[PDB]
Amino acid sequence: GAYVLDDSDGLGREFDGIGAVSGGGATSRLLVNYPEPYRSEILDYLFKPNFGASLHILKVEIGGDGQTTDGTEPSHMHYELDENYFRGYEWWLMKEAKKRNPDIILMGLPWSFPGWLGKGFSWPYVNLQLTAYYVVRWILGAKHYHDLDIDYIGIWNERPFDANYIKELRKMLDYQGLQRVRIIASDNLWEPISSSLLLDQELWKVVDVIGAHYPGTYTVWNAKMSGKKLWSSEDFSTINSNVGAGCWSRILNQNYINGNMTSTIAWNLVASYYEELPYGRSGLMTAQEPWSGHYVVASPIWVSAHTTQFTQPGWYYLKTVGHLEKGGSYVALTDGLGNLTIIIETMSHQHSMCIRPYLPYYNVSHQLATFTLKGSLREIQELQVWYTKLGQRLHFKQLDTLWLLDGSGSFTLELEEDEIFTLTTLTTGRKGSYPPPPSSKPFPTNYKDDFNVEYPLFSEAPNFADQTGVFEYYMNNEDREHRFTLRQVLNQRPITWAADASSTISVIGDHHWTNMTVQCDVYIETPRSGGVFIAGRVNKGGILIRSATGVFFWIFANGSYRVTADLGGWITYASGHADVTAKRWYTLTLGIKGYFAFGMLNGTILWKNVRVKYPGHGWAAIGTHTFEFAQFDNFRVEAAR
Template sequence: MAEHLLQASRQRQVKAMTAAAGSAGQAAVPLLLCALLAPGSAYVLDDSDGLGREFDGIGAVSGGGATSRLLVNYPEPYRSQILDYLFKPNFGASLHILKVEIGGDGQTTDGTEPSHMHYALDENYFRGYEWWLMKEAKKRNPNITLMGLPWSFPGWLGKGFNWPYVNLQLTAYYVVSWIVGAKHYHDLDIDYIGIWNERAFDINYIKVLRRMLNYQGLQQVKIIASDNLWEPISASMLLDSELLRVIDVIGAHYPGTRTVKDARLTEKKLWSSEDFSTLNSDVGAGCWGRILNQNYINGYMTATIAWNLVASYYEQLPYGRCGLMTAQEPWSGHYVVEAPIWISAHTTQFTQPGWYYLKTVGHLEKGGSYVALTDGLGNLTIIVETMSHKHSMCIRPLLPYFNVSRQFATFILKGSFSEIPELQVWYTKLGKPSERFLFKQLDSLWLLDSGGSFTLELQEDELFTLTTLTAGSKGSYLLPPKSQPFPCVYKDDFNVGPI
């Protein structure tokens, strides 16, 4: 009898899901089963024993080498459309964090961003396009977290390899003036400030920076360090109580989903403060989907920030098309909403900073992972990924081999979630065009008769979000203009818009 009921349930689900799949020729989406029977492994999602770490958000870097340079030159309405796909809540990537380069007049990957102080007595808070971009992000999401980090410093601050640390007070003044200028001239509140991208840190400088921030009334601005490796910053913090006190977040780059013991012993927030850097193909999307889950599962990282926000620089430059989307033709208006935008949406549209991870998160028996987060008010969001090794390799670090295979996974909701009646379902399948879906809403899943449990049939390279939230959407505009080569004749007076 139970077998018969399960088969009937499967047939009803298949019929509904196939109808939702859309046009003929597309593969049917997978089975979602009320757990009358529970084939495969079972995973309990429970808050009875408390919650895990606080979630701080998903974000991206603008700059770190002039990576948004071409965006500002896009004509309307295409420029605003691109910004909507990046920042508008419940539309596209819906990012929680924007990290920008504090321009330092130095070449930092794909170009140079201008400093707000070319020399000691020079201050200009309208140079470059990061001010404009931060305001556009805030316009769309007033709650977005803003971060600043120097990649380079102008030479007048000192001489030698570690020239920013020749005069600690002067360098701290230079950085704090950027934060003060952001507020005074653009009404932008900077939430986090970094030290020096992927370079040496100076313990005394970090302390001086904190004191100068406090002196300027900027106690609310938090310090993240060191935007390089977990060590030696975390070991230094354990040996120096003042340093431990003044650093709010330990940020590491390309951690490979792992932390180190010293970093965890500090009991500070741990962030992957730069990650991804991978071609925004489906493989790049698989990389992004895997690390968004596993950075927390393996390394307790509560924020992940992609380099970079938008590939708005020429593809022939280093790390071409390594943004969440591509916008490298301002002369034509052409842009591409790449798969990582919709991978981001699986998390960002159904969580917010201030939610908490459940303690009951982890790896699936036959490969892949699952996380669950709650706002503590009864809402629950579950993200399940089964990215294969071949289709989720990031540009760095080396990814050890693992295997993912077809499986049934039963999730059992307990604690305050045991009586949730319904979950919204969003689905992505990466790979062959005939099988590919990006952020597609499926029929909702009813749990009233299943005892608070459900079963997913999982294949390789899939992503599910199951959530109590109903506000998600796959935003869209009319297709942008077709790609065109750079025109043979081109005029520009360079006097329009931020530069």
């Protein structure tokens, strides 16, 4: 009936911000080669204040060279003694975010780790000091090379924590003058971190924030008891259609109302990875075509705005927040300077389903809601109104100011289903706009890369999405014809998060491709035992990369070749002998059309008219038999979709 908003009785919890995750894994892969001005426009829609999603927080993966959901991300230490703070794109992304918003909050979290940290086991807790040293080097590098202050560091994404590790990490941060960096744990479930904090005073002293994943809007009694800030440190992960925006809208309010969570962070920031990879199109917006420049400013962007443009980290929730009588919810926040923001959501069940968890049905229906401002809020006489309707839709439209001149400090709204209203004293709101970008276009049906770039802007060639292993630009001064190549640089399996393949692989192109010719120069670095391949019709990647099928043309340094149906090499289409050895350059060609494939070695037919499964479709790919050095040059693909 009448909902009282008031601060006379005091405040609720401090609001810590809304944000998103870039990483876990390679979710921002295709954004780096967007041409201008589009790359810059996309970044403005995400980070520019008073414009688009206007995010308060950016969480990034600390790449560990393993597969982490939609690809691998490169580490700053591939090997013992190796340090390089210029790989991948997270450094770049953080800098672009800070340029737009100097106050944005930065977080880092490992999903996987380089294998050498395990000292012969696939476990990062064998040598606590060693793993801590690795993580802290990342934070130092961020500051020293990019002028980035990392605000929060996590433990091990969705994997067990070790209490002694957390203590050693704190001691190691302090020893290196990073007393200011805070620790969030354990990026998994509420337990066992929450009970652990209550039983161990020394642990409690070193953990600043309990971050839970996909909590379904709820927390647990032990977490409330700890008195720690509680964050949904990973949530969302739904296709960014109107339904995903509904999900986002609902949890943004209800994480606080139901779960005392004062921050929510969406996986992921922007869908810049091939859509046929796991959880495709699950970013706040979509930017998956750097070749065309086409991007889509999706609904979730504006749902974010309804909160982020009108609140900042450090505002407070009022004690008076709740559910509306006929379904939906409201929160309200102040900054202790006389501003007030109120956010109302009426998302219907059927249009707000998240993947984790699925909620039993609940009812929403038309209702009137009356709000009365008591206490220090009584003196407000004017509120700006912003409105979104989801599903033919209207996004972030500024309505007529509402006036509370009558002296009643009260007002009423007609609420229907699937709406959001933001009512705020702030006058800074803006529906940012750039002109439409170029239309959508398939990946180019003819495509070439000779990797001849002397000072590349990024450490890897555009469009190649590593799914196991790490491929990088490589300069070899001691050769002329292959001075500039692409090289696979892992020499041992990472401490994996996902089930990485046993073979390294990078995919590229159009998952729809069905008939195609792939050609590449290849170079095996390991005598006797080394091997490389080129492939087409590769149908799965990311978390599922082990499952990839397609047509794989392998050559080995012992003078053999195989053609397989799967990355695992369990199904043979053909095999035989070849004039192939280590440390020599060969040109491989692979032609697939309908039921039949053929392979060429240096332009000469090696096998032809081999029967392959059809129909079938997928990416082109290159890679290596195991985690071993190998080089690639002059890649070409001609394909029909």
